[PDB]
Design a protein around this ligand. Sequence first.
Ligand SMILES: Nc1ncnc2c1ncn2[C@@H]1O[C@H](COP(=O)(O)OP(=O)(O)O)[C@@H](O)[C@H]1O
Ligand SMILES: Nc1ncnc2c1ncn2[C@@H]1O[C@H](COP(=O)(O)OP(=O)(O)O)[C@@H](O)[C@H]1O
Ligand SMILES: Nc1ncnc2c1ncn2[C@@H]1O[C@H](COP(=O)(O)OP(=O)(O)O)[C@@H](O)[C@H]1O
Ligand SMILES: [Mg+2]
Ligand SMILES: [Mg+2]
Ligand SMILES: [Mg+2]
Lengths: 516, 516, 516
Amino acid sequence: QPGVLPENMKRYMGRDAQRMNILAGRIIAETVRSTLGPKGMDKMLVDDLGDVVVTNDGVTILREMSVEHPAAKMLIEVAKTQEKEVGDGTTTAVVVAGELLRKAEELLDQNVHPTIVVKGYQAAAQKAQELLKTIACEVGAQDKEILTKIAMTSITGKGAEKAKEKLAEIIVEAVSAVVDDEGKVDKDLIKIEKKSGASIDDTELIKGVLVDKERVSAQMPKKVTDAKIALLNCAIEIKETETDAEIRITDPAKLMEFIEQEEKMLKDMVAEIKASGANVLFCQKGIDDLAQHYLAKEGIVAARRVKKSDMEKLAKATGANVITNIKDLSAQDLGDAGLVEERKISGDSMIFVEECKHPKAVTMLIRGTTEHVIEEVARAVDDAVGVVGCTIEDGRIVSGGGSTEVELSMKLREYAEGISGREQLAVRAFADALEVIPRTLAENAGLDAIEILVKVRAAHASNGNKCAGLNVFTGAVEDMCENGVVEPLRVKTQAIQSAAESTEMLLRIDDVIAAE
Amino acid sequence: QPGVLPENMKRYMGRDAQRMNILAGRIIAETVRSTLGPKGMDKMLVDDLGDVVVTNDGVTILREMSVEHPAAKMLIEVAKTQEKEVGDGTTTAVVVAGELLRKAEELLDQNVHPTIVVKGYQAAAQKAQELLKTIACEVGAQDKEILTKIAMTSITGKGAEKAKEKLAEIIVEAVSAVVDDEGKVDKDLIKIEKKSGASIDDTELIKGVLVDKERVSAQMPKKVTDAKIALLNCAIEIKETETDAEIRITDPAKLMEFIEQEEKMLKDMVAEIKASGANVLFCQKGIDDLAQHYLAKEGIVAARRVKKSDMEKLAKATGANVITNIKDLSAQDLGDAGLVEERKISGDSMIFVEECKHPKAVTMLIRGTTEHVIEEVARAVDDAVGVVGCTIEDGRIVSGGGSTEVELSMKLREYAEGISGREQLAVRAFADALEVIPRTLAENAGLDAIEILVKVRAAHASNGNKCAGLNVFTGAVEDMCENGVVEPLRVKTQAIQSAAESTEMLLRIDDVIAAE
Amino acid sequence: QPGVLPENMKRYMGRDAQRMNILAGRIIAETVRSTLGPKGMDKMLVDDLGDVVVTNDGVTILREMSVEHPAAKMLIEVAKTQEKEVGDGTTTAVVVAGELLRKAEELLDQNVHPTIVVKGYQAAAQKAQELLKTIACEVGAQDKEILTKIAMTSITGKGAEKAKEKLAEIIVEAVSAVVDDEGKVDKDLIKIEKKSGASIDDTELIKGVLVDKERVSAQMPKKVTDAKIALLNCAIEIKETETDAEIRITDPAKLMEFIEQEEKMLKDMVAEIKASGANVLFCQKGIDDLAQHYLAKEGIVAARRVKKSDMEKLAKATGANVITNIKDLSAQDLGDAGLVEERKISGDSMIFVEECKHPKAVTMLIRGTTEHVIEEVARAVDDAVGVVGCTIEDGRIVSGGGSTEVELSMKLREYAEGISGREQLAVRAFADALEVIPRTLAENAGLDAIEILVKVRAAHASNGNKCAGLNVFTGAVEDMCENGVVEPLRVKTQAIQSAAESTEMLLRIDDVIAAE
Ligand SMILES: Nc1ncnc2c1ncn2[C@@H]1O[C@H](COP(=O)(O)OP(=O)(O)O)[C@@H](O)[C@H]1O
Ligand SMILES: Nc1ncnc2c1ncn2[C@@H]1O[C@H](COP(=O)(O)OP(=O)(O)O)[C@@H](O)[C@H]1O
Ligand SMILES: Nc1ncnc2c1ncn2[C@@H]1O[C@H](COP(=O)(O)OP(=O)(O)O)[C@@H](O)[C@H]1O
Ligand SMILES: [Mg+2]
Ligand SMILES: [Mg+2]
Ligand SMILES: [Mg+2]
């Protein structure tokens, strides 16, 4: 009598399961296609709270639409990974994924079994990775001209693109500055600050850091040049034993003596600081109001309760050692900056620590007229920082504008010739799926995809040009490398690998069991 | 401020409109594919009232699912037309239609504009009609051997197929009998009766008609041989003027005289009937109880209030003229039958009018153990009656089992070679769409569609055999004409034309506006 | 204290009123733009009952969306009028109207007062009517080649366009046949019948009429050649005085005598009919069952209770006089038809009265696979019948494909040069508004409107070609007159006048007061 599997449950099997997933994928892909490339357009997303995000950024859009559909969630993971590993090409990856799903449907409607499609995809994907390596050009991690093209390509189609030359130079300087001694780039050592102002061109690089604290006492200097900075993360307050201790006073005179002893301990703390040669002081903990006095009388700029993250970046920029024992503070622990100034910026008072010599962290101060405008500039700067970092780390790049996908597509078909059996249809499918990129670029530019594809495919055939792609302005096939349209090899390798792995995962599903 | 278009309304534009329709079509198609062919399976459909229909019949299924979706409704119209014009191939037509929609999607995703797809389809469809004429064989409307194969093919895969030889012979006799003098077949002159009994083999042809009435008075004979039948659709009651008239009686004696005068009028009516030589009488109106008496005294079998439809078929079978004036009833108006008997059949008393000489209407009495079993036998008999009728009328047939579709497909591709431009992709699409039939046949038989298609396509290429199709039992390509697997040209021509016109109609839609 | 004007009321003044109307107009226009021209697309409209309409037809769409917005309702009236007066160009007229509203907004945002805009529009419109007369070519009401181009142009872009040559010839024959002796065309004498069948090419012209009634008695002939038809709209039943009358019978013998007298009156009625020479009889009233007998004995085909509208059209086709006194029926009242046949069509029995000699009414029998497909063919046939009628009546045509609007636009700008003052801006606005047609045609064809407009405008400038328009296939400016793309002058004159009058009406509104 009673039901075995839960009654409160929907279930989709075989064809229905496949359709459910394929459909979800395609629909996710279709909602971001319009954003792709130079003539890409932006979405405005409103949440249930009435908050607005306007952005071109693929993965951002996908996160902000609060998608519940279980298969869509899988595709969105593709975009999230692309973001983590590369920082660019999120839309590309998702769109390729959707296309693989769509091409898989044609094969499944012919009765090719899912596992065979999967097998075929896996083969094509491996081959694509191999081909992508032969396709990439080598570049040096210090080739600023090429790094700058990498950044500018990233910003193309973003609306921040109006300022792409200036932005790219700044971004290339910034990333170059924080490259560690193992040759790696930590996106975190480039602090992004966002502040309203006259325009986007007011955006600047700061060799140093911005600190959202003010000097602890107005009697201290507001400005100081060639400063010797002290980083202290112990507190400048009267020290207190760990074991519970209480004073007992029985003589009225001894009353003052304890107060005075405490005042002296504090005076001594400041004197030890002065002795190191420091004129500027950032402290992670608190500073007794009396110590604040003494510091000011010594002409020392001090800030209290500085964010741990701030101390860590201040250290990186100036060469200072964060100290936990005032007793052990020497001149060798002090950091150095050309200028430390408290000044206002968009009506906020902050402490600028700038003109450091060889900073290991820096600040990109992004400026624009309005908050939402800035936010999007920032999102674009993030994309560029990403790919510039990838290039510096990998030393491998490829041409953009769909050229690489077409070359890939063309070679994969050659590969498919030698595949025997049904698996072959899957390999050709995979090949054809890649052309979604050059097609969408044209589509978004109001061009005719079918004919441009014909033209671009031709320029790649024989022993033609792997760099040939559609210029969505002139309408001609051009040499994208010569035009400076390039991207890190890592964008393509990741996007394709991600799309392949996730669609293979979905195509293996023959049963969906949803609850509640 | 206020909304222009109604607020209580959903709307789907461009891509969304196309998907909505394409999807609906495909889903309708997919729900009947499983029924197609020799290894086709049946659906059991339950309505909101708890009534059951189990059937293989495509259009029946689609009517019984109470489909609300507006695009689906359009596809269902394809099945309904096929039923009206042919009586068979409803599943085929719907499945082809779905396939055309699916192939259209691939072209639309490449950015081929809908109107171009449409144009292409129209071309292919016209070409197909031309090709179908050259593909058809001629047959004579009196070729019983070929007509019998036509019927048997129809019944294959129906469960009534257990009795297909017997059924086919009966069906062919039946249709042959009602062919008019212009060579046309009216499916209506073959009355189908359904009655439970020992088995389906008890099913028989009746040269004559079954009447659901009993003789009007038990004093009349139950049986009568070589009968002279009278058809009267005026009433045997006392006649009454149209102008209002009343009798006035003032003399007591004249009281009887009026009653007697009426009795005489009735006696005279019967005597006029006897004088024509009639021993059996069917009357469309009523018969005064006194006339019933006189008729019985004269040994005349009479039935009253016979359905107009019954009178009309009785007339067609026996050669009688339905008369409206008893005065004008002569022996030349009488019909003839070998046997008129009232007898029981499944516990029901009815009047059999059988063994007529050259009947122009006839009765197929269908027998089976249970109601739902009979119903389906009947549905199959209907299909066969249809195609036999089509063959007799058209004189053109083609080979079955997917052979004709494959030949069509192959030729249409040849045609497409000479199409310049984008329209060509649509023509090839159309061609490939047709192969859904041979694919589904194999699929339903658990065979591998991809390889059998390869084999069948090969048998058709060069100057091979237009009759080559997959035998879903042996697994081989065989000569379907030699195996007696044939269908009226009209089933292919209509199915294809219907699918083409309705999918073209849908593909022209770019906006869906639904209310409430 | 209490409110003066009703409290349950919204109100929009000045700017808000203007925006409300302008907006409504534009939105209505925008919903039908997509349907315009050769590459136009169709909408699928679902009502609250779940009934579907799929159509390209502008005014049909606007009627089926149940639009409540008060200003939209006004624009819809534009479409309805175009339908009544012309039968084609409904979309054109509505789109022009929207455009006038949009161009009016630009002028209102510059602070040009509404009345001045209005004044300007009125001037432009009057000028346009004058210019349209000089632009039109003359044609003879019997120039079948030109009438045929007119029809084909009409059907272009409709999906019935697949059969446009055949359809056009039939339509031209049909309209030509019903032209009266004052040279006018009543669209009502061309009866449209819709019946499913093998395909749209089965569509045919019937010189005569279809009657949905079967012969009254099966004993009558089903077919009859060179028939003499009798039209009777009195009844063939026993006549009854107006003054109340009753028979009194006192003698039993006189009983029969009254019945017989009535039978004789009926026999006499039939005999009088036979005497006129008639073999076929259509009666608007009833026919006594006994008369039906006598008629059949005389070999006369008769139908009873024929729709008044049917009698009227039967008369028009055959040359018969509908008679109300059987006594006064002579041979000169009889009509003539080559063939009168009762036969089946899509499983329906009807009476065909065809092959009449010089019919003054005819039937277009439209055929297609499915109901919704047919409906739309019919809608297109209606459009063509309309413009063919217009041409025959007016004798004036103009070139299509936007050429005329461009010529108009160009001349109206010339006119505006000599307008002094602000009114001038309104005249140039009007001029520019007309270009919405050539723009939308291109747009719908995926072409670039801005550049094609530049090209077309050039071909018209100087003393160029008034017939020059965009070919939306080749992409070139071509001679639309040479390509046979033509329309009745009435389509442009009415569309423009309608748009002008209704937008002027709306622009005069400064206050909207809505209730409830
Ligand atoms: N100047 C250009 N011309 C053509 N294509 C370009 C140009 N600049 C960038 N692209 C292409 O646009 C695509 C990336 O666009 P974008 O909207 O940033 O998507 P994603 O989120 O996937 O990076 C890449 O194929 C890139 O090569
Ligand atoms: N013996 C057979 N072998 C292969 N195919 C057959 C055979 N008999 C019938 N068919 C095919 O089955 C199809 C019709 O199957 P059916 O289930 O009746 O569908 P429909 O409702 O479309 O007629 C036709 O394509 C016909 O060629
Ligand atoms: N072959 C053609 N080439 C270009 N334009 C055409 C052609 N045939 C018709 N047209 C144009 O299409 C327009 C009519 O389109 P249609 O969708 O019927 O709208 P409407 O309901 O307003 O008549 C007219 O401007 C006519 O000139
Ligand atoms: Mg990018
Ligand atoms: Mg069948
Ligand atoms: Mg039109």
